[PDB]
Amino acid sequence: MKGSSHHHHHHSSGASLVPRGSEGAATMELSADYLREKLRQDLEAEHVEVEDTTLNRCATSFRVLVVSAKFEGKPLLQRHRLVNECLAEELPHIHAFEQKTLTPEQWTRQRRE
């Protein structure tokens, strides 16, 4: 049907063609280091550790760790919500995400694992 209108002309875009590299699976898109570095610089932490259960599988999960005082200044719930706000668009793509924020004193106090 063509009752409801919205766009008379065709969509357009702009992308220059230059030598460098082609596309792939997700070597650059969606990665542990991507979310790690992003959160680290975005949240500005001291020590961070990211992990993954190998994307090549039925189940996919990502683990992120952050240790600093910047989180202390903000409420407990604000900490977790902060990490979610950053990867808000990426979150939906993550089948399973798990983050944990703590202080440098607590971590250094008891860091067995």
UniProtKB/Swiss-Prot annotation:
InterPro entries xrefs: BOL2, BolA, BolA-like_sf
Gene3D superfamilies linked: Phosphatidylinositol 3-kinase Catalytic Subunit, Chain A, domain 1 (3.10.20.90)
Modified residues (N-acetylmethionine): M28
One GO CC term on file: nucleus
Record flagged with keyword Cell division: no
Family: Belongs to the BolA/IbaG family.
Protein name: BolA-like protein 2
Source taxonomy: Eukaryota, Metazoa, Chordata, Craniata, Vertebrata
